[PDB]
Nucleic acid binder design. Structure first.
Ligand SMILES: [Mg+2]
Ligand SMILES: [Mg+2]
Ligand SMILES: [Mg+2]
Ligand SMILES: [Mg+2]
Ligand SMILES: [Mg+2]
Ligand SMILES: [Mg+2]
Ligand SMILES: [Mg+2]
Ligand SMILES: [Mg+2]
Ligand SMILES: [Mg+2]
Lengths: 129, 88, 218
RNA sequence: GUAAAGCGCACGCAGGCGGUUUGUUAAGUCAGAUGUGAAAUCCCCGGGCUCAACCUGGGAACUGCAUCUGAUACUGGCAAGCUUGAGUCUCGUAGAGGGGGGUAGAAUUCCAGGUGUAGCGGUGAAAUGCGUAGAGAUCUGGAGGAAUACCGGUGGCGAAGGCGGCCCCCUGGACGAAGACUGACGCUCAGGUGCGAAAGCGUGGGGAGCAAACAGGAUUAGAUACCCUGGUAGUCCACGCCGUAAACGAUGUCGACUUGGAGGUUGUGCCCUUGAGGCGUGGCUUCCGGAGCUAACGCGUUAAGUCGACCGCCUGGGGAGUAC
């Protein structure tokens, strides 16, 4: 959005899923693609690309196993006016461990397990189940 | 609103170049005119509120621009407020 | 270039947002049903019928629609199976329990004319009793041979035979319906995007169904 | 939304929040470490009173504050930018947007005069009332005030309240399109300022119709009413005040997403533009309705669906939006 560009990413992804869409598109961003990269390895998204050397536009591909979709849970937490910063011993564990939790570390964007395995903390980004 | 022979006129007096109808120095100054000119209009009628709403608009809108200049080039601010006899 | 050149399109702009990936491309008022997205469905469905027919199962062809009633038996009755070309009763798939009861008085009603047991009671009486056959032998006459719920249901238009399909997905009886632009294929587990109408469309595929089913059981 | 709850509506200071890129900083933040965080409680493991309560060793914890050494993804600061947000310019378009001043035609009432004559008016009936001092009706001339049939629409404009005859003058906003320009200059906004139907208030005007009060007639058991005959404030104007309404979509403003169908109104591109016309592409707006949401009704791309930023508000009924 014009105020919360990251929160929009999640919404556009979840809104697409519900509508059984194929691919979601929206303006890119260092953090955005960075986040989009994680869900990739996590198998939450098929692939992802962008267009524009001056006018970048993210391109994500939704995913679904059977009748229902894959990403059946995606919400934010550390939003503006109410940001969240956890330690290496406070990091959340989405769905008892199954779901992932994106968190920006001094090393870069990671997941609840990722950063933990490292032994460092960062500003939580969102919960993906 | 404003006459072309005036709008397109002033633009060529504050623009740091040519046909720069965007330049704050320009737009901002362009606002004072339609404002000062209307003050003579509002002197009469008075009860005409729906027109003052727009008047106030361009006024605050003008200020929103002045604050910007101060936050982009201190000089340009004090360098323009004089040419327009602003601040009062 | 094959026989599949008769059900190109149907049902004007009324359509149904759901039935889209099967639309060749709207043109001249109504749209078209992408046959290239129909070819797989053309057999994929039949394959299962052919497969299930070998299991000596059951198949009920639903087509209450006039332009399909009289012209449906030859594909079901002749092929010896199950069909309902009339007002689909309420429960002939769920409340079958009590419904079958109606079938009995129908069967025993038949036997009346069978032998001399028809010349019983006033000549008027026979008439009052014979009427029941008209209704019975019609609304059930083509399902009487069903001594238990089927194993798969193949319905023509997915719209008209609405209730029919409903009860099905509530009993676990697979459904092979030839939907259409204004149809709601979400209730069909084996969609066949074709002209729900067209006197020729119905016959060809309908008869084509019994074809695979006929020798389905080898 | 209807249960208690969106301020009547705007503008906007403080405050909160802030599109995209690179460098930089290292404040937030994260990592390590050093202090300190009294002991005792609590907790874990383990000891002694025959057990327990109790007593007790060590640790764990004390989620904090500070300091030092780092890490630089994100937030923040600084520098230089970028253009899609926002804005400026150009040229068009529609409009009951506003303020001022004119002006026209229909009708009412009244004044005068002509014709003409015993009724008119009113109600469910009636009666009050008006009529032989000549009404009513009719026709001619005149005075005056208020509102603008038809077009008028499921229409349009406005922040809200609201805004309809035609003409001129001063003026605001909205939208489209080729574009050109500025370069995050933005969103929200307690307090604050301003706008606010009608009724009402002050001074001075005006006053046709209508009409609280008031007065007759009728109804009725009664009728301080509904009905009828009258009628004052008021309704109208100026200027100042009062700020409320079921000030209602009973639904705060801003932005991004999310199947469809039929229609309205206004801009623009295009099509043998040969046409009423046909195909798109924007603004605003009706009705139906899917997913979803909902306690249900229902809402449903103009959301009451999925989200984000800021603000107002609710916490059982009565007492009470009352007392002080
Ligand atoms: Mg209520
Ligand atoms: Mg309420
Ligand atoms: Mg409101
Ligand atoms: Mg201690
Ligand atoms: Mg930074
Ligand atoms: Mg509006
Ligand atoms: Mg008033
Ligand atoms: Mg007065
Ligand atoms: Mg609806």
């Amino acid at each position: 959005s014009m105020q919360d560009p990251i929160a929009d990413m999640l919404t556009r992804i979840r809104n697409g899923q519900a509508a059984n869409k194929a691919a979601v598109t929206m303006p890119s961003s260092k953090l955005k693609v960075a986040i989009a990269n994680v869900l990739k390895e996590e198998g939450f998204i098929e692939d992802f690309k962008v267009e524009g050397d001056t006018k970048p536009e993210l391109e994500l591909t939704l995913k679904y196993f059977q009748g229902k979709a894959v990403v059946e849970s995606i919400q934010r937490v550390s939003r503006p006016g109410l940001r969240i910063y956890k330690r290496k011993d406070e990091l959340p564990k989405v769905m008892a461990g199954l779901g992932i939790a994106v968190v920006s570390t001094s090393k870069g964007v990671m997941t609840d397990r990722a950063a933990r395995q490292a032994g460092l903390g960062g500003e939580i980004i969102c919960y993906v189940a | 609103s404003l006459s072309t022979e005036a709008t397109a006129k002033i633009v060529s007096e504050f623009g740091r170049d040519a046909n720069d109808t965007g330049s704050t120095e320009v737009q901002v100054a362009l606002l004072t005119a339609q404002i000062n000119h209307l003050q003579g209009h509002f002197a009469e009628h008075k009860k005409d509120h729906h027109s003052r709403r727009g008047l106030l608009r361009m006024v605050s809108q003008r200020r929103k621009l002045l604050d910007y200049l101060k936050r982009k080039d201190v000089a340009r601010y004090t360098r323009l407020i004089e040419r327009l006899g602003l601040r009062r | 270039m094959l026989k599949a050149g008769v059900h190109f399109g149907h049902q004007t702009r009324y359509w149904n947002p759901k039935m889209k990936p099967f639309i060749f491309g709207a043109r001249n008022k109504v749209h078209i049903i992408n046959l290239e997205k129909t070819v797989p469905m053309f057999n994929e469905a039949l394959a299962e019928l052919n497969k299930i027919a070998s299991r000596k199962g059951k198949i009920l062809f639903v087509g209450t629609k006039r332009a399909a009633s009289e012209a449906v038996k030859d594909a079901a009755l002749s092929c010896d199976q199950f069909f309902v070309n009339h007002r689909w009763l309420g429960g002939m798939l769920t409340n079958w329990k009590t419904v079958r009861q109606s079938i009995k008085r129908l069967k025993d009603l038949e036997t009346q004319s069978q032998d001399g047991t028809f010349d019983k009671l006033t000549k008027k009486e026979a008439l009052m009793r014979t009427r029941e056959l008209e209704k019975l032998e019609n609304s059930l006459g083509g399902i009487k041979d069903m001594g238990g719920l089927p194993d798969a249901l193949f319905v023509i238009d997915a719209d008209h035979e609405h209730i029919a399909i409903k009860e099905a997905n509530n009993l676990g009886i697979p459904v092979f319906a030839i939907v259409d632009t204004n149809s709601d294929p979400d209730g069909v587990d084996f969609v066949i995007p074709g002209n729900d109408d067209a006197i020729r469309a119905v016959t060809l595929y309908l008869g084509a169904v019994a074809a695979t089913v006929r020798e389905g059981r080898s």
